[PDB]
Amino acid sequence: MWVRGSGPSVLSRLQDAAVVRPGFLSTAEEETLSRELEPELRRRRYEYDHWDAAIHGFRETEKSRWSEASRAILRRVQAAAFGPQTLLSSVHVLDLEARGYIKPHVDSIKFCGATIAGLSLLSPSVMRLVHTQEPGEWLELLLEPGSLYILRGSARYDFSHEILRDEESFFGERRIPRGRRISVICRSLP
Numbered sequence: 580m581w582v583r584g585s586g587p588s589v590l591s592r593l594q595d596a597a598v599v600r601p602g603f604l605s606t607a608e609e610e611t612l613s614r615e616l617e618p619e620l621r622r623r624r625y626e627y628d629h630w631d632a633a634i635h636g637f638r639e640t641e642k643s644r645w646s647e648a649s650r651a652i653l654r655r656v657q658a659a660a661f662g663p664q665t666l667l668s669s670v671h672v673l674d675l676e677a678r679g680y681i682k683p684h685v686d687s688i689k690f691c692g693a694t695i696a697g698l699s700l701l702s703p704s705v706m707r708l709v710h711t712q713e714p715g716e717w718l719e720l721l722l723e724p725g726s727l728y729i730l731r732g733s734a735r736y737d738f739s740h741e742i743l744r745d746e747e748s749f750f751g752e753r754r755i756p757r758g759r760r761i762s763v764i765c766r767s768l769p
């Protein structure tokens with residue numbers, strides 16, 4: 580339902596490395612995050628785009644000070660996705676416009692440890708993972724609003740990830756129309 584792959588072996592190999600938990604958040608939790616983050620994101624302009632930037636059509640913030648309700652959600656993510664690992668001192672909040680997208684990349688190994696965990700809000704999208712040496716090994720993850728994904732180990736180090744732009748936004752054969760998306764990303768310390 581939420582993962583498709585280039586073949587059975589990549590699917591088995593990454594089954595606990597690339598994880599989607601649809602409906603990890605309740606509607607109330609989605610609302611908590613939106614009410615806290617929408618106003619903060621509105622204070623910033625969508626950034627200038629660059630050809631050699633991974634992220635296109637976006638604004639963002641780092642946030643370490645959170646309401647108690649949002650902190651309860653972040654602690655649920657930490658329990659679900661991270662061992663005992665330490666998290667970075669801030670959480671990355673990313674606002675992609677409907678025309679925005681993310682190009683294939685591997686998160687910096689200088690600043691991010693073994694695990695990335697992301698909450699998706701507002702609208703559905705498709706995350707594609709592609710092996711960095713072998714373009715024939717890939718996964719597609721369907722990220723609906725309220726979902727948590729986890730990329731760890733090989734899914735974090737050996738595969739790029741990207742968020743498909745509207746015209747390319749397909750989960751298998753199915754078109755996933757893109758809208759404005761907010762994501763809330765927790766990362767481990769290296």
Ligand SMILES: O=C(O)CCC(=O)C(=O)O
Nearest residue numbers: 673681686697740762764
């Ligand atoms: O929006 C997401 O879920 C991922 C963002 C991302 O890949 C990044 O900021 O490195």
Ligand SMILES: [Mn+2]
Nearest residue numbers: 626638639640
């Ligand atoms: Mn920025």
Ligand SMILES: [Mn+2]
Nearest residue numbers: 684685686740
């Ligand atoms: Mn990334």
